């Protein structure tokens, strides 16, 4: 989670929409802003808080799915990797 990364133009436009201001991040900080995007947009369900629904949301489009579990860390990593580039420092 200390690997430095640059999100692609669309994810950047997603994180900067919830208060982000860097162009270079770590996985930690990216997950935090995705968290706030999820708060901000009420994507987190109250009936069961294991599923984020994003089918009508730009996140669904970046992620390629209508919904995912917040416990499916391996699939979230994957979906997010496909949306960034790694940098030196
Ligand atoms: C560490 C993993 N993050 C998490 N893990 C576990 C767990 O393992 O229990 N529960 C989690 N609950 C949340 C969460 C998310 C949004 C909201 S909004 C109100 C409460 C709340 C709680 N997150 C954060 C999260 C952030 C971004 C994304 Cl995209 C997906 C999940 C959890 C990470 C994927 C690798």
Swiss-Prot record:
It is found in: Nucleus, Nucleoplasm; Cytoplasm; Nucleus, Nucleolus; Nucleus. Induction: By DNA damage. Phosphorylated at multiple sites near the RING domain by ATM upon DNA damage; this promotes its ubiquitination and degradation, preventing p53/TP53 degradation. Autoubiquitination leads to proteasomal degradation; resulting in p53/TP53 activation it may be regulated by SFN. Also ubiquitinated by TRIM13. ATM-phosphorylated MDM2 is ubiquitinated by the SCF(FBXO31) complex in response to genotoxic stress, promoting its degradation and p53/TP53-mediated DNA damage response. Deubiquitinated by USP2 leads to its accumulation and increases deubiquitination and degradation of p53/TP53. Deubiquitinated by USP7 leading to its stabilization. Residues 1-78 are annotated as: Sufficient to promote the mitochondrial pathway of apoptosis. It comes from the Eukaryota. Residues 3-86 form the SWIB/MDM2 domain. Residues 1-87 are annotated as: Necessary for interaction with USP2. Ubiquitous. Isoform Mdm2-A, isoform Mdm2-B, isoform Mdm2-C, isoform Mdm2-D, isoform Mdm2-E, isoform Mdm2-F and isoform Mdm2-G are observed in a range of cancers but absent in normal tissues. Interacts with p53/TP53, TP73/p73, RBL5 and RP11. Binds specifically to RNA. Can interact with RB1, E1A-associated protein EP300 and the E2F1 transcription factor. Forms a ternary complex with p53/TP53 and WWOX. Interacts with CDKN2AIP, RFWD3, USP7, PYHIN1, and RBBP6. Interacts with ARRB1 and ARRB2. Interacts with PSMA3. Found in a trimeric complex with MDM2, MDM4 and USP2. Interacts with USP2 (via N-terminus and C-terminus). Interacts with MDM4. Part of a complex with MDM2, DAXX, RASSF1 and USP7. Part of a complex with DAXX, MDM2 and USP7. Interacts directly with DAXX and USP7. (Microbial infection) Interacts with herpes virus 8 protein v-IRF4. It is linked to Seems to be amplified in certain tumors (including soft tissue sarcomas, osteosarcomas and gliomas). A higher frequency of splice variants lacking p53 binding domain sequences was found in late-stage and high-grade ovarian and bladder carcinomas. Four of the splice variants show loss of p53 binding. Lessel-Kubisch syndrome: An autosomal recessive progeroid syndrome characterized by short stature, pinched facial features, prematurely gray hair, scleroderma-like skin changes, small kidneys and consecutive kidney failure, followed by severe arterial hypertension. Region I is sufficient for binding p53 and inhibiting its G1 arrest and apoptosis functions. It also binds p73 and E2F1. Region II contains most of a central acidic region required for interaction with ribosomal protein L5 and a putative C4-type zinc finger. The RING finger domain which coordinates two molecules of zinc interacts specifically with RNA whether or not zinc is present and mediates the heterooligomerization with MDM4. It is also essential for its ubiquitin ligase E3 activity toward p53 and itself. MDM2 RING finger mutations that failed to ubiquitinate p53 in vitro did not target p53 for degradation when expressed in cells. E3 ubiquitin-protein ligase that mediates ubiquitination of p53/TP53, leading to its degradation by the proteasome. Inhibits p53/TP53- and p73/TP73-mediated cell cycle arrest and apoptosis by binding its transcriptional activation domain. Also acts as a ubiquitin ligase E3 toward itself and ARRB1. Permits the nuclear export of p53/TP53. Promotes proteasome-dependent ubiquitin-independent degradation of retinoblastoma RB1 protein. Inhibits DAXX-mediated apoptosis by inducing its ubiquitination and degradation. Component of the TRIM28/KAP1-MDM2-p53/TP53 complex involved in stabilizing p53/TP53. Belongs to the MDM2/MDM4 family. This is E3 ubiquitin-protein ligase Mdm2. It comes from Homo sapiens (Human).
């Amino acid at each position: 989670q200390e690997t430095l990364v640059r999100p692609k133009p669309l994810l950047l436009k997603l994180l900067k929409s919830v208060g982000a201001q860097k162009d270079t991040y770590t996985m930690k900080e990216v997950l935090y802003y995705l968290g706030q995007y999820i708060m901000t947009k009420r994507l987190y369900d109250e009936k069961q808080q294991h599923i984020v629904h994003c089918s009508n949301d730009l996140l669904g489009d970046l992620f390629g799915v209508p919904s995912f579990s917040v416990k499916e860390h391996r699939k979230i990593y994957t979906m997010i990797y496909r949306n960034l580039v790694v940098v030196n420092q």
